[PDB]
Design a protein around this ligand. Structure first.
Ligand SMILES: Nc1nc2c(ncn2[C@@H]2O[C@H](COP(=O)(O)OP(=O)(O)OP(O)(O)=S)[C@@H](O)[C@H]2O)c(=O)[nH]1
Ligand SMILES: [Mg+2]
Length: 323
């Protein structure tokens, strides 16, 4: 059996750990009931942190509530957040959150997410708070998949697929978590580099003066043209195609790429983004980098993109297991 050392790289929140959860579902035993119950505290914490961030932005963005009474809910919320048991969601809390989300000022702020820092799954959980809070709540896979926890260490996933024994490694992509990346570059059969399509109008959590996609582009440049990776198969997942789809129709790609020309559309601007990343490949002549529009939260999609990825691994047979 061939051993494939695979590295998931990309900037913060690009979707690397969600691809890991997918491998568990698609290629391992999937989630047990008890594991699912472990995500409730995460889901509840994510719901709380996402609403607090929209409330908080009400001020910084100078946005009034569609009903000044919601201001009462906001404070109370802020107070409960420092008093509730971490990861919990009492009825008193979700009632307040349910009213705030139903407020049009809040909805105006939510829509201006790009202007501040808000979880990807904010709308996903808030819009469905009622269910998440229905007594007897045990998460679904999409709920678990929508989950968010910044990766601070290194995580390995091993599974057998098409007779290759994968050794997949997950790591945080935020600036401070990149420092350790170097110790992992030894003997890499393949890298799936992940970039969020929807990050073209966002700013870094690390430096609000740095666009997320330029950073991603720089990192890609450093990884793509890296010594160790001479052989190494490199694939680009242009991720969060679903969000890019909704986003493209409203925000100008020019905000990221001042020189960008065409119809601010999905097929067209998505391709432009593919090029800006692939142009970076100083070895485009000799190498050819396989990219694809992906939705990491979409099981069947990841299942089909990975099967193609691994068919590459199998094809362009090369280097494997490091050390
Ligand atoms: N809508 C949507 N949400 C996604 C997609 N991929 C990931 N997410 C959501 O984005 C959040 C961030 O992704 P996550 O997998 O945690 O990123 P990461 O790149 O591993 O993050 P880090 O550890 O480097 S900070 C999660 O809440 C996750 O469910 C996607 O294709 N579409
Ligand atoms: Mg992660």
């Amino acid at each position: 059996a061939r051993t494939v050392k695979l590295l998931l790289l990309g900037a913060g929140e690009s979707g690397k750990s969600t691809i890991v959860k997918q491998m568990k579902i698609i290629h391992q035993d999937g989630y047990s009931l008890e594991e699912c119950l472990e995500f409730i505290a995460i889901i509840y914490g994510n719901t709380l942190q996402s609403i607090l961030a929209i409330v908080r932005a009400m001020t910084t963005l100078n946005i009034q509530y569609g009903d000044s009474a919601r201001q009462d809910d906001a404070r109370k919320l802020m107070h409960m957040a420092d008093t509730i048991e971490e990861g919990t969601m009492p009825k008193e809390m979700s009632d307040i959150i349910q009213r705030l989300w139903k407020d049009s000022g809040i909805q105006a702020c939510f829509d201006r997410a790009s202007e501040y820092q808000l979880n990807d799954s904010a709308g996903y959980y808030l819009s469905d708070l009622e269910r998440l809070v229905t007594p007897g709540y045990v998460p679904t896979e999409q709920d678990v998949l929508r989950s968010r926890v910044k990766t601070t260490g290194i995580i390995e996933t091993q599974f057998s697929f098409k007779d290759l024994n994968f050794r997949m490694f997950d790591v945080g992509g935020q600036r401070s978590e990149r420092k350790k990346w170097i110790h992992c570059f030894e003997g890499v059969t393949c890298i799936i580099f992940i970039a969020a399509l929807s990050a073209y109008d966002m700013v870094l959590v690390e430096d609000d003066e740095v666009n997320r996609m330029h950073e991603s582009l720089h990192l890609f440049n450093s990884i793509c043209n890296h010594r160790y990776f001479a052989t190494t198969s490199i694939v680009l997942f242009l991720n969060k195609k679903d969000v890019f789809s909704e986003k493209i129709k409203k925000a100008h790609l020019s905000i990221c790429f001042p020189d960008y020309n065409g119809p601010n559309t999905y097929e067209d601007a998505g391709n432009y983004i593919k090029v800006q990343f692939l142009e970076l490949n100083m070895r485009r002549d000799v190498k050819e980098i396989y990219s694809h529009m992906t939705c990491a939260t979409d099981t069947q999609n990841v299942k089909f993109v990975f099967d193609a990825v691994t068919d590459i691994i199998i094809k362009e047979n090369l280097k494997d297991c490091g050390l």
